[PDB]
Amino acid sequence: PTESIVRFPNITNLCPFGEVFNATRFASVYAWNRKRISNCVADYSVLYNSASFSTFKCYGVSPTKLNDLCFTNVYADSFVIRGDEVRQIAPGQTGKIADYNYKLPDDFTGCVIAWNSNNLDSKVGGNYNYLYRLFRKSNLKPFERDISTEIYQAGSTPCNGVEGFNCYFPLQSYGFQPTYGVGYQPYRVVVLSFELLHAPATVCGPKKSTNLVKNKCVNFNFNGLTGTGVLTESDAVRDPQTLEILDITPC
Amino acid sequence: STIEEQAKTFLDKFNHEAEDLFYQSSLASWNYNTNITEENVQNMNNAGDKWSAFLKEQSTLAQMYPLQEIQNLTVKLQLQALQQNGSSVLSEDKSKRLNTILNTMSTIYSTGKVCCLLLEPGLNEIMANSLDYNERLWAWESWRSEVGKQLRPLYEEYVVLKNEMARANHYEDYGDYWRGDYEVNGVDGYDYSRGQLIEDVEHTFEEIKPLYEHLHAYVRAKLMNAYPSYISPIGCLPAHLLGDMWGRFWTNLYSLTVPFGQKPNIDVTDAMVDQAWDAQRIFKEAEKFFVSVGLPNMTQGFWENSMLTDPGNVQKAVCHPTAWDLGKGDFRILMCTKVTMDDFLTAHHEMGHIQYDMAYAAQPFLLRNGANEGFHEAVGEIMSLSAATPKHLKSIGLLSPDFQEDNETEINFLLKQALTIVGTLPFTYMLEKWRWMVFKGEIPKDQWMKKWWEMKREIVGVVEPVPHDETYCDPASLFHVSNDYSFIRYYTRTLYQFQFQEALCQAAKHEGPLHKCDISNSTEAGQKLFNMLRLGKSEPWTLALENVVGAKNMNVRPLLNYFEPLFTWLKDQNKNSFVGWSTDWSPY
Ligand SMILES: *[C@@H]1O[C@H](CO)[C@@H](O)[C@H](O)[C@H]1NC(C)=O
Ligand SMILES: *[C@@H]1O[C@H](CO)[C@@H](O)[C@H](O)[C@H]1NC(C)=O
Ligand SMILES: *[C@@H]1O[C@H](CO)[C@@H](O)[C@H](O)[C@H]1NC(C)=O
Ligand SMILES: *[C@@H]1O[C@H](CO)[C@@H](O)[C@H](O)[C@H]1NC(C)=O
Ligand SMILES: *[C@@H]1O[C@H](CO)[C@@H](O)[C@H](O)[C@H]1NC(C)=O
Ligand SMILES: *[C@@H]1O[C@H](CO)[C@@H](O)[C@H](O)[C@H]1NC(C)=O
Ligand SMILES: *[C@@H]1O[C@H](CO)[C@@H](O)[C@H](O)[C@H]1NC(C)=O
Ligand SMILES: *[C@@H]1O[C@H](CO)[C@@H](O)[C@H](O)[C@H]1NC(C)=O
Ligand SMILES: [Zn+2]
């Protein structure tokens, strides 16, 4: 353990988190919008320390450690919900939002961010542009999206696409006004999901790569996996900068 | 599928959009009340019509689901509330006639001249401060002749139409329809019946008869000193000498009958003015009280949305004190606060109403109400009882740090509060009993006034100065009778109030008399109260009553325990004077 070398792919592209967090309009919860972010270096420290977020909870990853790792892909899903339903955006929950609108798997590996947005999208007289699904035939498999507006039938007799007795319109509208309580005021939510695979990593935290050494017992850290042992040119790690396979021998 | 599931889906669809229409109508009403103008009236009326039409349509839709199939006892409650077909059973012509009768009654009562000398403040000040026999008799008889005489045939037609409408809804009478509020079915060991409320009021009134007899004898003896030649030692109090037009409360009699007139009462108006309270600090103190008990804070929008002082000269506003529950997490208070003790106590009371509204906000829309009609004022009022004590005023900096209280002031305070609390129970009981008998059909149309005055003589101990024939309709003069309002809520409110006060005072481990008791800085009392507050209307009022007092039915023993030192002093004072009255004696 004479020295320590760390090697990440060289990326100098600032990651586009402004295009997700700072957006003119957010989509309704029943049909949320998903953005894939890749080939970027993500500074998660400013995101955590912006201190304007009501809720910042990371599930399955330490909030400080995720600053410095490598991930194959990141997905960001954004919508607007009511103040009291933000607690339903978490694995294992149940309600109107979780059952029919946005269902998260139990083995979640991402961070949920939510901040109050009563200044932007709530006006006197009501803001009836934000809807949510109220009736559905069955629950939602994790990360499933439904935009159908078919008439929901509760009784035995079918109805040919007309509202009436025992036939309802599935979607119902949030009404937003500035005088509402805190529980009913709008909240903007962004969910970040980190996906890992055997494919080469693309999104990585900010760290400076150093020159590699050989034939000496040094501590190595490649793409977030750390070990110790002599690196020999050829239990075997492929460094990302030059794509050379290296053997690790205990010292 | 099964009828239960269809009912659940229908209720889930209704609660949404019911909350929305209710919020819009309530906001329109608030805008009108805080800022009166021609334009706002149209918005208020439009929103009211929209909400009413929606409610009628949803009732018609809810009529489909048969109530036998549902077996949830909460879905069934919401459906029972929603399928209230009510007055629509009447024919269109009959409904038009009934609404015309009600509007004519309200119009004739609102504008009544005995001249020029309207009811308010022209006749109230005469009836409350004249101190002259002839003037009071003239005002009393003139108001009777001008208003009650003209309401006889309208009231008769009102009786017949309302009785037929109530019989149409599978009820025996209209009085039974009123008594249907105090009725819980389907729960074993907690059930109640409408035929139980006709009793359980006679019993509790038989319990407090001696205390009222002693108070009446004391008042008559102290009142013969004035009006020397118009009152008899054995007999009844003449009707117009009770300090009010109807004699509902006896408060105005206080200036005549004080036991120890030398000792002033506790009054902190000058203490408030000296420290320059800013009409907002009063609500800060109320919030401090309710926080110290253990109940939560006030919402952030309560302080900015609500208006707590008179808007000014440019903007006119009606500001009778009111607590507003607009829904969607919106709570407000309408008050024209001034620096007086009365405003301090009423701020406590309205803050109590708001604190009651916050508790059951999680319940569905149809179940956001007090357990019955008497639970809500009583919860509002025990807060003022706790806030009026000399200990509580002493803990704040407004009362003097070194205050020594003598039992003379205890007697003054007890008598002052008793002239209002137990002075109105016989009147409420007699009025509601007469209305129940009239609706039932026991009193023929030719014997209304004879039975009314016979009951006044026998139950209340009040006799008329001049005889009234059958053309007169005295009970129709009261605001509640002519404007279609129930009156048994004021009998049960005091009983529930004193039961709750005793339970909360015993839970907070207090020693001594009940009237010096205070529940601040007591978390267990607050928790016991909050357990009952959070139920809403979901559970039967008997169970909600048991969660605090520990007894299923209402009891009058705590009311007498509150007024025990006064009762002993009254017995000592009246050991010499006559107790009781003779029906035979009449002023003429
Ligand atoms: C979004 O806007 C805020 C406000 O100007 C800014 O401070 C922030 O850097 C922007 N981007 C992100 C990712 O928050
Ligand atoms: C960055 O990494 C790539 C990997 O193929 C390499 O070709 C290149 O020389 C490195 N340096 C710069 C400045 O791009
Ligand atoms: C009250 O209503 C009038 C309508 O003529 C309006 O001009 C005024 O601004 C209102 N007062 C408020 C909003 O405080
Ligand atoms: C009645 O239905 C509600 C849901 O609507 C449920 O929470 C409750 O447990 C049901 N009551 C009983 C006794 O099962
Ligand atoms: C409403 O009217 C219908 C008419 O068919 C009647 O059957 C029903 O009992 C009424 N609802 C009541 C009395 O609650
Ligand atoms: C909530 O109540 C506590 C209890 O004293 C108080 O310290 C705090 O300031 C209150 N907060 C709000 C927002 O009212
Ligand atoms: C109560 O007040 C009366 C008033 O005269 C007084 O005589 C008496 O000493 C006081 N105390 C008791 C215990 O009666
Ligand atoms: C309640 O507690 C406060 C907290 O200091 C104290 O100032 C006050 O005197 C107490 N009052 C009573 C009646 O216990
Ligand atoms: Zn009240």
Residue numbers in the entry:
A (entry chain A): 322 to 555, 574 to 590
B (entry chain D): 19 to 133, 141 to 613
Sentences from the study reporting this entry:
The SARS-CoV-2 spike glycoprotein is the major surface antigen of the virus. Its function is to bind the host receptor ACE2 and mediate the subsequent membrane fusion required for cell entry. Recently emerging variants of SARS-CoV-2 have acquired other substitutions in the spike including a number located at the monomer-monomer interfaces, at the receptor-binding site, and near the furin-cleavage site.
To test if the cleavage of the S1-S2 subunits is directly responsible for the greater stability of the trimeric ACE2-bound S1/S2 complex, we expressed the Alpha spike in the presence of a furin inhibitor, decanoyl-Arg-Val-Lys-Arg-chloromethylketone, which resulted in an almost completely uncleaved protein. Incubation of this uncleaved spike with ACE2 resulted in more than 50% of particles being monomeric S1-S2/ACE2. This conformation, like that of the Wuhan strain S1-S2/ACE2 complex, is incompatible with the trimeric structure. The data show a sixfold increase in binding strength for Alpha spike, and a twofold increase for Beta spike (compared to Wuhan) arising from the shared substitution N501Y in the RBD. The substitution of the asparagine at position 501 in Wuhan for a tyrosine residue in both Alpha & Beta variants leads to an increase in hydrophobic interactions between the aromatic ring of Y501(RBD) and the aromatic ring of Tyr-41(ACE2) and the aliphatic moiety of Lys-353(ACE2), in addition to a charged hydrogen bond between the phenolic hydroxyl of Tyr-501(RBD) and Lys-353(ACE2).
